[PDB]
Amino acid sequence: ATYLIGDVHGCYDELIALLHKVEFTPGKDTLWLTGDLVARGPGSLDVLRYVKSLGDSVRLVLGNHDLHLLAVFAGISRNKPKDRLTPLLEAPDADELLNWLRRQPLLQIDEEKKLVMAHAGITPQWDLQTAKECARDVEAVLSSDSYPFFLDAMYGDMPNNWSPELRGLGRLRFITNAFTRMRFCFPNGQLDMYSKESPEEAPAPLKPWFAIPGPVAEEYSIAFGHWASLEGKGTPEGIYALDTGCCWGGSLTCLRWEDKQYFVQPS
Amino acid sequence: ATYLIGDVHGCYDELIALLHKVEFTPGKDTLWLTGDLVARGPGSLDVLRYVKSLGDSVRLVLGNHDLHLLAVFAGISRNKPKDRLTPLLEAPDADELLNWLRRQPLLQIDEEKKLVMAHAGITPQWDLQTAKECARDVEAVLSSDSYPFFLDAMYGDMPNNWSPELRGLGRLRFITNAFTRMRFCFPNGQLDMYSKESPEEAPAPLKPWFAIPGPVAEEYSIAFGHWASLEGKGTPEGIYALDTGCCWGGSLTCLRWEDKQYFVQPS
Ligand SMILES: [Mn+2]
Ligand SMILES: [Mn+2]
Ligand SMILES: [Mn+2]
Ligand SMILES: [Mn+2]
Secondary structure, three states: OEEEOOOOOOOOHHHHHHHHHHHOOOOOOOOEHHHHOOOOOOHHHHHHEEEEEOOHHHEEEEHHHHHHHHHOOOOOOOOHHHHHOOOHHHHHOOOHHHHHHHOOOOOOOOOOOEEEOOOOOOOOOOHHHHHHHHHHHHHHHHHHOOOHHHHHHOOOOOOOOOOOOOOOOHHHHHHHHHHOOOOEEOOOOOOEEOOOOOOOOOOOOOEEHHHHOOOHOOOOEEOOOOHHHOOOOOOOEEEEOOOOOOOOOOOEEEEEEOOEEEEEEEE | OOOOOOOOOOOOOHHHHHHOOOOOOOOOEEEEOOOOOOOOOHHHHHHHHHHHHHHHHHHEOOHHHHHHHHHHHHHOOOHHHOOHHHHHHHOHHHHHHHHHHHOOOOOEEEEOEEEEEEEEOOOOOOOOHHHHHHHHHHHHHHOOOOOOHHHOOOOOOOOOOOOOOOHHHHHHHHHHHHHHOOOOOEEEEEEOOOOOHHHHHHOHHHHHHHHHOOOOOOEEEEEOOOOOOOOOOOOOOOOEEEEOEEEEEEEEEEOOOOOOEEEEEEE
């Protein structure tokens, strides 16, 4: 009755296959999506269409490729035709779908399941309180008339440490990086924005973020998925890596929460 | 014989393998290298040591990563763990190596072979004479005691039109970007610093620099290799894309000039 899927990437067929396999019913059931919905992969259009028709029985979280799509939709970036976003960008429907997308959250918290989902996870460097305020802030900009201006501003790499003093372009850059593109941390809670590899191929000082004990990880389960490289692997208890790289010829993974049962759809 | 090899990203093994395969002999042969000796692969240190030892038998042009390396060495830019430069930087002969690196050219001309090498190529906006001057001008800076000020200055993505009017900070950045970061242009030889994907799967007006008729290409053969996603293919007669992305899953490519024969070393 509660399912958390992981990076769909325009894999509409696979999504609906999994959803049918568990007999998902919008009435009784609820879907958490890790949210790299629209990438490398054919039916990005159908995914967005479907997901949006779920309404309240979907709890989405925005990811790097979702943000990128919005960037191209608003002319901040160029479409890379190999993303296969064109069908969706092309039409009748685009404004409807994309205005909806931008209004979607970056954080999802369920107090009773003691569960937290973000796309990349939660930096050791911040507590839930901070994570909550940072999600609200970026969400506010994304939901605004001036969203194209954020998207453009969001693009940097070079505040690496959270540091409550932080403000302006630096502050939002960091938060966007923490939520939507985080994998490796330096031994302290820093951010590496360049290596995308299985934990034990990573160069010298880089540990995976979840391997650095943090305040949220000691009261809450974390679910996430954008780190395809690690294949939902050597994560400690309470940490669920749902991105098993469906679009890369890997697989789409569903987890039934209440009984912690895994279901798997190949490509 | 004359050999020309593309980006040797710290892939020493492959380089020696490929050089044995042609029985490269520093006595009677000469090696042209494309730049980016030092990026992602495991053995930048050995790559640097070897090529330096070739003296006049080697014929180098600096790439973006060699400059970045320089920048890290001078404490101008932060070191990226992914680059794997530590063994090089920590080496007892680090100073000798890098101080030699600074000294290397950005442009190589041979009149008898009618051949011209630069890391990314030659702007359609440059005639040979200008390309010569700009190369000389940056080399003099790199060569000098005050080179870390330059390395700090190269940073912008733009002035992106050449103009003899250009002076100071703006002049050095353009020419640096033209030699070492160029890929796409506008119908009038203007530099795009943002699309790093292949010509076939790209945005509109932007045509690969070499697609646009220029004074040098009309009179000279051009060898380069920065454009890795170019995958070596789709070039006009007279232009030679040697970067096949060795540190990636790609391969190291060697061209003998007398012969226009290719020898390829997988990674
Ligand atoms: Mn992602
Ligand atoms: Mn993804
Ligand atoms: Mn390179
Ligand atoms: Mn390069």
